[PDB]
Symmetry: C3
Subunit: 445 residues, 3 copies
């Protein structure tokens, strides 16, 4: 039992017309959701008849469903190139030709390159002429290049943002006979029950904080968070500098894909050539932000079977529920009971978005809520208690490798100490760029 009640009243509702007005006297209880696992135990008494009725209302979960917005596919790409050098006055290497080369025109040096539907480009670099470089003509020679992209892996990744976060509070309700039911509530919503009604009257749940983020789906392999804003168009140095509208087009490096300017770099070396890319590896990004991840005590994880991502509040929930009881009002509420907590472990890293996981062993005799805090109240642990002994865990963020933090916890208001002690690893500054490519295939030596 939890002490969740905020107000208790009697209210008459009148079906105004249909010429014959009907009134219903309802007992009213304004209660707080409190936290996941918190349970209001309400003994009701008949307003009119001498009758009693015991009700239990439990906050089971608080979820925000991500309704997706813009979306694209991407993957790991690598350049492959063909090269050929012609001396001045040989082949296409005349007057303006080399300096005038366009991206979309394939050189005659590569007449075997047929019809392509792959991301590709063509280049011509002026190299040295004269006897010193194997030519009779002393004017600049021409290095012709043809380059296409290819998928390193045969898997792709879909990046998307979230436009809507649709709240759903779920409650478990125990009736007088002990029969259990669940209900779902949206913002400003009401459900009817056997004994009256329950309504989410004030809702303060949402994504709040100071960081923009986005998500990645790996088909059949889960989701990942990206701790950066969703890039709307392809930009060099960002996730999605190459992007497509389908998984298959990533794998084939189809030409319908978009890419930011100048992603392919060229190192002319007379008769040798290197074409390289220094692109963001989206799979490295995925492995870091791999779900579940917790940010501002929202835990983002894969939905039941749904797919798509939800944000779970596994601790405190900020919502007011209005309870109306047909012809019954509050007689008394059930008092909270004390719990015993022991420290189990602290695992993870410091100065990182993923944070650290602290685990507790919590022993009690009734359902309720453990609340804990450090001295200055910068850390806050909120975990469920039950009849028996269960292990509960939540994410915390620290900025120090050697953690030794004293907390004060209780389920019933009498605080006792508890020392959280652990060793966290550092995560050194990283780069997601990966070099790809190398020597070209020389066509005519």
């Amino acid at each position: 039992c939890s002490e969740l009640i905020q107000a208790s009243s009697r209210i008459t509702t009148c079906s105004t017309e249909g010429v014959n007005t009907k009134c219903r006297l309802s007992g009213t209880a304004l209660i707080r959701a409190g936290s996941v696992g918190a349970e209001a135990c309400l003994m009701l008494k008949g307003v009119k008849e001498d009758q009693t009725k015991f009700l239990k209302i439990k906050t089971v979960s608080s979820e925000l469903s991500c309704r997706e917005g813009q979306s694209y596919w991407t993957g790991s790409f690598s350049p492959k190139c063909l090269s050929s050098r012609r001396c001045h006055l040989v082949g296409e290497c005349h007057v303006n030709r080399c300096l005038s080369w366009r991206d979309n025109e394939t050189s005659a040096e590569f007449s075997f390159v047929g019809e392509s539907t792959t991301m590709r480009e063509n280049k011509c670099f002026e190299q040295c002429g004269g006897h010193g470089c194997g030519c009779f003509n002393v004017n600049p020679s021409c290095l012709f290049v043809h380059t296409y992209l290819q998928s390193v892996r045969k898997e792709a990744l879909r990046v998307f943002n979230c436009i809507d976060w649709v709240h759903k509070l779920t409650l478990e309700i125990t009736d007088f006979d002990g029969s259990v039911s669940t209900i779902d509530l949206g913002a400003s919503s009401s459900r009817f029950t056997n004994w009256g009604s329950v309504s989410l009257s004030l809702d303060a749940e949402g994504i709040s904080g100071s960081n923009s983020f986005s998500f990645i789906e790996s088909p059949g392999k889960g989701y990942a968070i990206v701790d950066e804003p969703f890039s709307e168009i392809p930009r060099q140095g960002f996730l999605g500098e190459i992007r497509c509208n389908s998984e298959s087009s990533v794998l084939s490096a189809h030409e319908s894909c978009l890419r930011a300017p100048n992603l392919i770099s060229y190192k002319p070396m007379i008769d040798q050539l290197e074409c390289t890319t220094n692109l963001i590896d989206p799979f490295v990004v995925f492995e870091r932000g791999s779900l579940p991840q917790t940010r501002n005590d929202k835990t983002f994880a894969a939905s039941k079977g749904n797919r798509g991502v939800q944000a779970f509040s596994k601790g405190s929930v900020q919502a007011d529920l209005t309870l109306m009881f047909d012809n019954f009002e509050v007689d008394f509420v059930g008092a909270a009971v004390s719990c015993d907590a022991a420290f189990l472990n602290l695992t993870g890293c410091y100065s990182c978005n993923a944070g650290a996981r602290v685990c507790l062993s919590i022993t009690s005799t009734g359902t309720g809520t453990l609340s804990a805090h450090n001295k200055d109240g910068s850390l806050h642990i909120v975990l469920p208690s039950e009849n028996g002994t269960k292990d509960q865990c939540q994410i915390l963020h620290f900025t120090v490798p050697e953690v030794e933090e004293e907390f004060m916890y209780s389920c019933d208001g009498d605080e006792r100490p508890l020392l959280v002690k652990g060793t966290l690893i550092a995560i050194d500054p990283f780069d997601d760029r990966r070099e790809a490519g190398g020597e070209s295939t020389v066509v005519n030596p």
Copy 2:
């Protein structure tokens, strides 16, 4: 009538100072705003005298006003260039000079060019020498270039961010005599009425979510949202890579404008030259985010009365109102009545920021609030009901082209099925970069 009351009590208020303490007995009611169009119907009874009065409070709107922060003007620019190639040892084409050319040095080749206050730069590219390139000297020739920018349109765009979102809750109150009045409430605000007072005692409204955004003003042509962080300094590939401190500076491409480094590309071709830019077209950006736009159930629109932008809550409203009645208390509240709802149409795109529009026909016999949800509650619809038949719409976000979703709706709690069905279009990945410029005009 909407069912909004959460508590009812009597409270006494006493003055603590003065020649004498005065006491006031007041009935007190705590209600939820519920949603736009929701109306609380309260019948009051006298606490000491035997009297009744009927009172009605309606939530008319919930607005967040944008108070702007940093701002800048931008637009569409194209490059114009002059070119002149000199053989080595001719003109300025001496020793180090070509490879040492500064952006702010104008070549003697272009003396005919007047005094400028336009964004401009100067380049020198080494080119081939010898008889093959029209020169006796075999050393590199010098291609001298003078480039300036010009506005492509004679209009500009103003980009800004929002630092403050200030809440204004608007209520319609009907007194006992049927007299209607309007009040506006901000955070922790109270306003006195004929019959007591009403105060916004708890406010949970605000901009939330996982996206940062900014806005654009097109002078005389409304507003647009940008689904991206406001960039505070000029950056290539971003809105505002060229920016100014005024509209007139954009139109004249004034030299006071800032631009990110290396925005003009050069393709030297001996005696031909191309100077191009690949700039973000801000007008393409404006059109895609043109207001009104909905994000996380906030509808962004131009404020009423000329300018600034606003965020409207057109469905759910999360706010608590404390009502105080002088010498009166709650007798009873009005019950909600049922809605009939029919699905009209569903129009728009999927997997897009703008979303899709569901339209419904709602028939009722009193003012209230339609509430609808799909099977797993990932979709939620809140629209106002009235006496009679009205069309109500709201934005939803889907991720599939063929939508067929069953909803359960009600105004009074008696839920009935409603099937939303339709076809949404795809929005293929886009790029706002547009190529501009071309060949130089050749001087000799």
Copy 3:
């Protein structure tokens, strides 16, 4: 006294264990925090005995503690380069060698330079040959370049984001015996007192708005806000395009530092060479966002003891408090008293992130809350009133240089006019890039 009460009730609470029940009758009040400085004055009456008790609850502060995530060090860097031009067939200037030069290979031209652990790179640029350029050989000459980075100042900056914002609400309570005490509340937290309990039963405080941001620490000289998303990897044109894992690595410009590609530009001039950078100056960014800073009525400032940054609500506080009194209930609450307010000054910028500071002179005869709004309610002022005459200030945001805004204010609901007037300065579009570097030191052949 402030009028903060929202509801009042009686509840009976029963303990279920022991295996006989004890029941306690309690009076209940639901009040709003209202604002910093708001004070609820309750006189209580006995539920069973006839007795009176006096109680005072005051909102002292509402804080959001930043728990940090990813962090990195950065600073100001400048390049220094050595150059030496060799004619073709002299030194290493053979065949392919110049066009094939790798970044981490040091030329023989600079053997006199010892080995460094500094960020550095090496280049080779082809230049003109023949008699025109000081060579007998007509083939291209080689300009060899060795560049290294160095810190411009002997100080560094630490950039970080905030993953968690942990709420602490602070109340000052005067109990039945006149004893004054302070208590702290987290989300969904409860505290037992001499007279019952107070719980933070609904919390709507948190960071909201349409902007992402991050923070910088200047060691021993405070903090600054950055009005932009935290960049998770080094990127050109962004804060942190060069970044390190320690302060000492910034000062020594250590090679362990990461940098975005292509940060050093090269201008080869046959026997002259310039190496430059166009880097974001982080100290200019720091100065612009130096704390305290206010965004969406949250004031960001350094914590006391200077451990982290904090977000203060200095005006409105959106929170509901459930008060429970053992064997007592609400008799009456103290009425609000009136304010007189005079406009002092208006100082700051328009169309700026920092905004402008409005200062007011407020006179009252009791603690309370001044509330003000302009004609259309787009501007909102909430300041604390006290016994006597005090200066109160807060940040507003305007978009015009000549401000003249008409407000209506009150503490007790009786609105009176107040004219806010002043001149604000413009902050013209800026660029934080600063050019650094210059000519190389030329080695004698």
